[PDB]
């Protein structure tokens, strides 16, 4: 009547069980794990660049960073953390859980998704390789505006390596988007109608549509810039519409880029909230409609980053910016309603989800203030924008990514992350982030724009910069608990031998063994709603799931 199980599972595994798989792996789960690990490594690199910039910025003088060294620092930091940590980790979470969430054995084109991972990794390596060059990495900021990016201005090889590395990463991202759209469209469980799949897969599908809408424009613009640099191809000659041509093209890419960076983690948080609230995601149809509206409007409000150029139809883009701000509000209120009136238990995944809510709210207040061109004029290209987009980003792709990791780590590892370490990590991260980036609103409101290596002692914003440095180093130390937790909980750590380590789960990735079987499934439940696993594990609740649904 009793089963012969081991005292403790395998910690590490037999020698040489991973290297050849990593080289050859076609499974989506392992590829997603590699995405997560590599993206977190790039996050550490970009954060190290951030701490370098911050240590320099704590002092009015140039303590240890030359002007161009600091410029390369913020350039490569922004590029690493947007195009080489976030846009890859969205697809890392995709490969990780989306095939499970639709009841699929694998992704549509598994060799294509492995190719996407490898194309990303090597594109990131070549982009970073700008540093080893004597000139260094790219001086021009993440945006890489035109006349500063031509051969004449910034003639360095770091710029060319950056261009081609971003191109390779973009090809990888495009392949990933094609793969994920094909997977969601074609591969899907026998009962999993499009309107009953989890919010995360909806977000990933719309995110991939945006990826295809945007990243090809990045590839075209980067190839045009490379032609301009290596052939003098007059593509972006300022005497043409070159500077505004590049502005329009690059922003038509990047703004949908920030929304592909956001939406997948909106989906992650939408998966987190119902399970720890013990109630369905509030307004599921509302969430999907809000995601569709978000993507639609994001594709067409790109040029609110160009308010100060004096060369855009300001009223049109301001109106569209407000119109896209509204759906994010709908989604936020759906999240709040999901939390509303449930037996809330604040484990580390939902601690990170609520931290996302808190930080992203202030980020969005800053965004709505920025949306007005009259206000943007003063606060444009300043540390107010730094604070805005750091709040929104760090909320949506760091807090949300931490929530996703703490959530699906058991379902991808068979082991639970230490909860006390999760508490410590979350609180360190929250305190450090709010300390480092809150003061930057006032820092940029008073004259101190972005991309300044140093500032005069006679100028203000010195105590506030050292406050920001205290915050940045708080974040730096905060990273250590999470790394230790993952390292000591992958191979050691509380084994989870059942589905739903986070009880009251849903979205169908908890209908399969906690270390998911190769092909993700030995059994599929009766898919009849948005929560197949919740219905399976709690059959008695099914009637209730349909009884109170309409009451609201």
């Amino acid at each position: 009547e009793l089963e012969a199980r081991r005292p403790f599972p395998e910690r590490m595994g037999p020698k040489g069980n991973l290297i050849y798989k990593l080289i050859t792996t076609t499974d989506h789960k392992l590829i997603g794990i590699m995405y997560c690990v590599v993206c977190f490594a790039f996050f550490l690199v970009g954060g190290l660049m951030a701490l370098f910039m911050r240590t320099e910025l704590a002092m009015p003088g140039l303590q240890f960073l030359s002007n161009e060294q600091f410029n390369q620092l913020f350039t490569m930091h922004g590029t690493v953390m947007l195009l080489f940590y976030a846009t890859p980790i969205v697809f890392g979470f995709a490969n990780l859980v989306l095939p499970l969430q639709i009841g699929a054995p694998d992704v549509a084109f598994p060799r294509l998704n492995a190719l996407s991972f490898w194309l990303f990794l090597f594109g990131a390596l070549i982009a970073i390789a700008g540093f080893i060059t004597p000139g260094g990495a790219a001086d021009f900021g993440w945006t890489a505006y035109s006349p500063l990016t031509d051969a004449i201005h910034s003639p360095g090889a770091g710029g060319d390596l950056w261009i081609m590395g971003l191109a390779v990463g973009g090809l990888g991202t495009i392949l990933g988007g094609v793969n994920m759209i094909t997977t969601v469209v074609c591969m899907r469980a026998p009962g999993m109608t499009m309107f009953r799949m989890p919010i995360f897969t909806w977000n990933i599908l719309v995110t991939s549509i945006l990826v295809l809408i945007a990243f090809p424009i990045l590839t075209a613009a980067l190839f045009g810039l490379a032609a301009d640099r290596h052939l003098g191809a007059h593509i972006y000659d300022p005497a043409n519409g070159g500077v505004l041509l590049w502005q329009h093209l690059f922003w038509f890419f990047g703004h949908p880029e920030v929304y592909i960076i956001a939406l997948p983690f909106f989906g992650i948080v939408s998966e987190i909230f119902p399970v720890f609230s013990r109630k369905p995601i509030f307004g599921y149809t509302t969430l999907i409609y809000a995601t569709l509206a978000i993507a639609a409007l994001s594709v067409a409000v790109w040029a609110h980053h160009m308010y100060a150029t004096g060369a855009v139809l300001l009223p049109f883009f301001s109106f569209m910016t407000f119109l896209i701000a509204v759906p994010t509000g709908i989604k936020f209120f759906n999240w709040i309603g999901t939390m509303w009136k449930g037996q809330l238990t604040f484990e580390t995944p939902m601690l990170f989800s609520v931290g996302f809510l808190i930080t992203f709210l202030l980020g969005g207040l800053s965004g709505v203030l920025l949306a007005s061109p009259p206000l943007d004029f003063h606060v444009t290209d300043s540390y107010f924008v730094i604070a805005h987009f750091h709040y929104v980003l760090f909320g949506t792709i760091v807090f949300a990514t931490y929530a996703g990791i703490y959530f699906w780590f058991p379902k991808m590892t068979g082991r639970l992350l230490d909860e006390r370490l999760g508490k410590l990590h979350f609180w360190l991260t929250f305190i450090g982030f709010h300390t480092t980036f809150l003061v930057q609103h006032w820092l940029g409101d008073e004259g101190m724009p972005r991309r300044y290596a140093d500032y005069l002692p006679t100028d203000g914003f010195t105590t506030l910069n050292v406050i920001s440095t205290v915050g940045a180093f708080i974040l730096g130390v905060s990273m250590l608990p999470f790394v230790w937790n993952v390292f000591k909980s992958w191979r050691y750590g509380e084994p989870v031998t059942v589905d739903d380590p986070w009880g009251y789960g849903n979205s169908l990735e908890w209908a399969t063994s906690c270390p998911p079987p190769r092909h993700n499934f030995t059994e599929l439940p009766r898919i009849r709603s948005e929560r197949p696993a919740f219905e399976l594990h709690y059959p008695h609740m099914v009637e209730r799931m349909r009884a109170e649904a309409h009451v609201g």
Binding site: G16, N17, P190, L524
Partner: protein, 54 residues
């Protein structure tokens, strides 16, 4: 790791397209044994003989 790839090919056999099992939603790789097959589906495992495996 190459040795383990060979050993798993011997234990299970070559790999092919995926099939969804009839009653339930199980997905199975639809392997192909290289040697004698046991009374049930799974084959007797073959012993490595120092030669490349398909």
């Amino acid at each position: 790791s190459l040795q383990r790839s060979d050993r798993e090919v011997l234990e299970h056999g070559v790999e092919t397209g995926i099939i969804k099992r009839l009653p339930h939603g199980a997905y199975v790789e639809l392997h192909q044994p290289l040697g004698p097959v046991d009374e049930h589906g799974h084959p007797i495992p073959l012993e490595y003989a120092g030669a490349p495996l398909p």
